[PDB]
Amino acid sequence: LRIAIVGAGALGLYYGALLQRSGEDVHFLLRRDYEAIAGNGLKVFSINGDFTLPHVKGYRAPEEIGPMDLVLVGLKTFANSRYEELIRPLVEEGTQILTLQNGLGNEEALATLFGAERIIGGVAFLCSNRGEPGEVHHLGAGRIILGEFLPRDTGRIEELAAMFRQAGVDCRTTDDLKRARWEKLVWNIPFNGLCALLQQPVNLILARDVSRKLVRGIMLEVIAGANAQGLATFIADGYVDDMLEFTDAMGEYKPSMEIDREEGRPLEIAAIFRTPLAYGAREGIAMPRVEMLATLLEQATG
């Protein structure tokens, strides 16, 4: 099975590394650290034991790779205008596209660009900061839940789930990709939002009672927008308490958006915030706290 990794980053390189370690033909597409990876290799620093890959099949242009069986898009979503130029040379009849990037609107913009039956969505729970050119730092978790965009057929999702399980990634299969994306949004929106804005890790947002109270209300707004979107099964309100207690054992974790704010690179406001808001306002649901958060966030960074 041959794979393209379009994105790199903490997410793309980590799953890319684990795939070739379990014997899969993985073709990396790099920009920033092409010379530091082709000359050296990529080092994975993990809590489940470090490992290094001495040789890595690395490319700096998508046309050099050619058509692929699978393509992992782990890109940051501010470069979604680059979907056409980076993915087109990898598309053959039978090519299936996997997306692990945060928020909504990613599966939909790729289905319009290539085809709905090709699109597999993966909601990934990964604790990873990264990089002095060619290094990945695995800090926690890593589990994936796989779902197809066009909802119908069993074999492909199972073959992919087993493949990630062969690579040592905890992998699950679901019938409702929409719901699982919205379930991740319940954590993503308050915690990537408030933490990037206030420039404070999750524990300090959780330490104040009134800030906890804010978090709940953000979460309930997300749930309401989720529940009236066309879900096969309803997301209960108790899930707020579940995700609240979940984050309480993450310690001093700084989420991805906060790290981007600290590193001077742009933030994924469009996919994490504006798009769920657009989908929520499409069905006419009040989401004032999300909107306020979205606005302040793009005010803060410009």
Place this chain on the structure above:
Amino acid sequence: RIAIVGAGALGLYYGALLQRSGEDVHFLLRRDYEAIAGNGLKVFSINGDFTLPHVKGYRAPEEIGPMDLVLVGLKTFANSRYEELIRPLVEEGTQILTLQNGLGNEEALATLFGAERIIGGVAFLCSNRGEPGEVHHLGAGRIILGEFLPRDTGRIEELAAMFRQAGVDCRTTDDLKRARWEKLVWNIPFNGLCALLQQPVNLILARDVSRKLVRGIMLEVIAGANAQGLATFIADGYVDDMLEFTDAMGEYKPSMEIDREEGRPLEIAAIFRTPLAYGAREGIAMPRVEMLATLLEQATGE
């Protein structure tokens, strides 16, 4: 009003937060009386560090005298010392709050002093200690408060309010017994396996068949819980919820593993042998908890 009987990684932490918000806190120190009478204790947290310049410390409980509340944070192998350590602190109206691990603690103190004095607190805290008078708080800290003998709310809500004022996320339940068993679902696989294998939680969770083991251990604890006269049944699926909860903890080394590393005794009796007793009393097959308890006393006998 408050006496701290324990002076471990949790008794110090909670007592330091209690007097920081202006409570009359009296610490019973043993190993490090002289280090805290000279300098005071330093609390290092993820929620910002603080230092108490002066600490009301004592070496004998008869010097402290009658109290309003005694927080017991003792390690459960010192439970034979209940009478000598707590009796001088007890007057008519004194209430005893137990925050230690496992079972039997509420009932022992109830037999010893009076059941209408006893308050059970299931606490969840990540804390290693140890530079005589230095407390490290790595995460969480939330407490669920129950009364052993089920009479009133004011008493339990006044204590809950008192903790919340001090910055402790503090809840209240009507089923203390259930909540103890709820924490046993986590404490048995993880404080068990990690101490035995001498590995952190992420490794135990990394192998597929080891997750299946954890599942099985967990299901037994639940089965031993559900036949214990609980007001409301613990469902399985609470398994899936501690499986995913522990996965957000990264490279975490539980209290029992830390105690194994430092070569100090383990709380096998309260965490393992008492619940196994409670299940056998009702006749429940718990082969895995048994094997674990036993292998764990085999490794720490030598």
